[PDB]
Nucleic acid binder design. Structure first.
Lengths: 151, 73, 47, 81
RNA sequence: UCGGCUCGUGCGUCGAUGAAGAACGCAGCAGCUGCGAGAAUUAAUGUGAAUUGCAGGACACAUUGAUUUCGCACUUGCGGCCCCGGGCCGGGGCUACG
RNA sequence: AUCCUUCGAUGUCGGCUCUUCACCCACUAAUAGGGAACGUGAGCUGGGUUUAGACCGUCGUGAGACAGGUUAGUUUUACCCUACUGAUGAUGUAUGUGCUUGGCUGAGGAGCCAAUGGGGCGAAGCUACCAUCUGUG
RNA sequence: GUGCCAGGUGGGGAGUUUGACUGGGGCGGUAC
RNA sequence: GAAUGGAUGAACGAGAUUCCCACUGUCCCUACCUACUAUCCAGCGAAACCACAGCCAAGGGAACGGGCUUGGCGGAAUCAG
RNA sequence: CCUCUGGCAUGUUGGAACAAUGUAGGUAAGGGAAGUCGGCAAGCCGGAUCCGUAACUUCGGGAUAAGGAUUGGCUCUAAGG
RNA sequence: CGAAAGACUAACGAACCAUCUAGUAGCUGGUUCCCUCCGGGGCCGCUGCGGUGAGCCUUGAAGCCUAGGGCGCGGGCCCGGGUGGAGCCGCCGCAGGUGCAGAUCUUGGUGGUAGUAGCAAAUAUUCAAACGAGCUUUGAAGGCCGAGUGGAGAAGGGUU
RNA sequence: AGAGGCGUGAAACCGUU
RNA sequence: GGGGCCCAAGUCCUUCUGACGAGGCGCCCGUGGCGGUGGAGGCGGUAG
RNA sequence: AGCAUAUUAGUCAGCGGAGGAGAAG
């Protein structure tokens, strides 16, 4: 992992590779949930899936529309990436299962570290006028998170 | 309409499998030319099984002996 | 409407469109990992 | 679950297109992979009637045209010949 | 680096007794490779206890002993002659040009 | 007149829109003259001009030529940066109601289909110098 | 008529050429 | 300008031209309505192009700068056009 | 154009909204080609029945020339095997 | 071959395929280390060979990384540290397919564009249940095709 | 396996601190 | 002229290592000083 | 430095026929 836990005893980790979810949406969502308490992050991701809370798109915001909810983040551009939120919810469920496996206090877990890396791209093709063929590429991602006890 | 539209009228085969060379070579002699060495090496003695020439080489290494057997036990 | 020769060619091409046996992956000097597979729509026979 | 095989067999046996599988006997159907006739006999699968296309309107106007109606100058589209 | 390239040496052996080449087929469980309905090989000789991805060879202890298709025509189309067997069917041998 | 820039391309006449010329008819108060890559083609159009078809005249033995005439001839791309127009934001404690054609629901009462079936009248809203509203020290 | 040579004809066909300078090039001109 | 054909003359022509009737949003002079887009969202997801980049005035300069000179000035990140 | 037998799921998705610009349709008072290179496109006409039909002509045509009237529903009469 | 447009001859004012052929080009483009002198020197660098270093190395070679310490006008080099796992280098000579930023260079990889253009031709879907971790199936509606979006073949495909 | 069906593992580019 | 099967000498002491190195005896063979085996003259080989 | 003789070149491509060598003598 990057940024190994400061207190390895009171900490848990979760990982995932070659996840067929968009890298940019995932990165924005992970940056949104970083530092949250695990219960707060779970509720926030469910709200994202319910279009009740937004994910601010701060770096990959080209063409991203504007929403009243992004004002909660001091930003104008925000979306509701459902797939990224559900992948992160799966990963957090795995992380808290690992925490339970080590006897940690799940009700006091904070998302200390989270990182989204680009994975090898997946190839398909699209057909273009005048008999041309262009790439249609999936951009999957690796995701890692470290939760640490803080109370 | 000489392109995509004309490509849809393709129903009759010009060529089929040859009974001698197997490609999709009636003249007694084989068609071969010096202006295509790549074609000559694609089909030449040694690209097939050589199911008679290899035995010839083995028998040459012993003088084409026949009618004899190794000494019985 | 087929000839005998065309049908035999097609039968041979059909018997070659199977995956490799799994136990071949356990041999001592095996470099193969999968099968020259042909799909009727993706690649056309030489006819 | 999926009943495509059962419906196709029922259509072939009943000689119809019109096949009605009982929505409640979905488990007694789906294990009739060959048995379709037995399900027909006990009424679990039925042949629906033909959708009605009545000729009452046609017969009534034909009688009206027999008396001579809708045959005036304003109803003719072809020449006399 | 179990491949190339270059130089040199010795030899210098195809085919109607049917070649080169092609097709198809053959393993207890596709390709390459090896084989031909005796088909993943038979016999013999030498060697000597293995083959191996998986159980499955009484390996006589004199361990004999592991390791096809490509007469007329090219559609399997149609013959003819002489024998053999079964009562038309099957088998064998012939039937190109110069 | 010159040939400095551009021939691995700076789209070229005019008009239209928005911040040739000439002649005549009419109105007007006046119907002044110009520039902006002879402003302006990813704004248009394509009548002219500058491909390939064809006709005529003249020229040429001929193939062919002619700011000589004639006819027919594909006008591509913005999602980038800036500019500009607007918009968030940063810093700083009536399918309404009649009528009607064809079909359909067994008929009627009631309806539906015909990419808005057709047609009459029509609320609201929008909208017209097609306002009997306002425009200054 | 055929074979061989000789003369003619032969853009039907073949190959090739169609100068330079030059207030762009062509026309003119020669400052070749 | 006379079978490099001259002249004409009904029928015919997705051939070229002129005028008239009728018709009309071609126009005066634009307005409204419908469908599919565009728009925003979930999912999916290219390409062209790219020295570095990207606010102007004038100057000089390969004689029409975006950068150089002298001035004007300059305020994150963006969205629809 | 509508339906029955037979078939299908709207043609590589769905949801919200109904801005501009667009693509495809509809309408527009008064005027009626003033638009434009040019009536471009699009709008007038359109089926049947009964009347009527010019110049010109190769006597065949032109010709549905042009122009006019009518057309529903219902109840009858007459004629036609 | 052409009822003639130089039209057509498997997406033409002389097809396509291979060879001659690396055809020729007074033309365009590119042409790789440092310093010095006028207007040659490289205890610079790369690969291999002959000698030499009683050279180095699993107590860690090459290679690679490094806001570590330095040397040289510089071509470059030395040392520290890391990780890496099997070879390598100095000096005297010899040899060469020996140094790249360009060539609309070749091959491979990757960006901004960009979560953007876009997923808009053929009228249309809705309710309930079932299976299931989670536009499918069944039933019921509403629709469409109506010389068919029906039922069967030929050519072609070859197991769909 | 900071060798996980793959020796070492640079740069461009990206994530995070 | 072919084919087959054979023929020298360390796995010695200490030690490094995940497992032919290093330090000794230089010990042993040598007419014999390429490959394999978890950097080898002391398993196949090589010389005769 | 054009080009026709020349050169390329008795060379590429094409056809026929061998041997362990051929051809020549």
């Amino acid at each position: 992992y990057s940024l190994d836990p400061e207190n390895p005893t009171k900490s848990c980790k979760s990982r995932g590779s070659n996840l067929r979810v968009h890298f940019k949406n995932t990165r924005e969502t992970a940056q949104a949930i970083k530092g949250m308490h695990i219960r707060k992050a779970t509720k926030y991701l469910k709200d994202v899936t319910l279009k009740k809370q937004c994910v601010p798109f701060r770096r990959y915001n080209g063409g991203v529309g504007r929403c009243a909810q992004a004002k909660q983040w001091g930003w104008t551009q925000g979306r509701w990436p459902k797939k990224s939120a559900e992948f992160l919810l799966h990963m957090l469920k795995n992380a808290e299962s690992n925490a339970e496996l080590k006897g940690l206090d799940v009700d006091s877990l904070v998302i200390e570290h989270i990182q989204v890396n680009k994975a090898p791209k997946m190839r398909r093709r699209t057909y273009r006028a005048h008999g041309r063929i262009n790439p249609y590429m999936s951009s999957p991602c690796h995701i890692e998170m470290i939760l640490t006890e803080k109370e | 309409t000489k392109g995509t539209s004309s490509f849809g009228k393709r129903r009759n085969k010009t060529h089929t499998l040859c009974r001698r060379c197997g490609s999709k070579c009636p003249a007694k002699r084989k068609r071969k030319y010096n202006w295509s060495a790549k074609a000559k090496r694609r089909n030449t003695t040694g690209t097939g099984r050589m199911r008679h020439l290899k035995i010839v080489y083995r028998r040459f290494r012993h003088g084409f002996r026949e009618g004899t057997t190794p000494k019985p036990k | 409407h087929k000839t005998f020769r065309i049908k035999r060619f097609l039968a041979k091409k059909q018997k070659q469109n199977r995956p490799i046996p799994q136990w071949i992956r356990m041999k001592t000097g095996n470099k193969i990992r999968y099968n020259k597979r042909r799909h009727w729509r993706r690649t056309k026979l030489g006819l | 679950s999926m009943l495509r095989l059962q419906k196709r067999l029922a259509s072939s046996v009943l000689r119809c297109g019109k096949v009605w599988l009982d929505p409640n006997e979905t488990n007694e159907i789906a294990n009739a992979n060959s048995q379709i006739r037995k399900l027909i006999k006990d009424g679990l699968i039925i042949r629906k009637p033909v959708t009605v296309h009545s000729r009452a309107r046609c017969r009534k106007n034909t009688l009206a045209r027999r008396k001579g109606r809708h045959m005036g100058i304003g109803k003719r589209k072809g020449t006399a010949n």
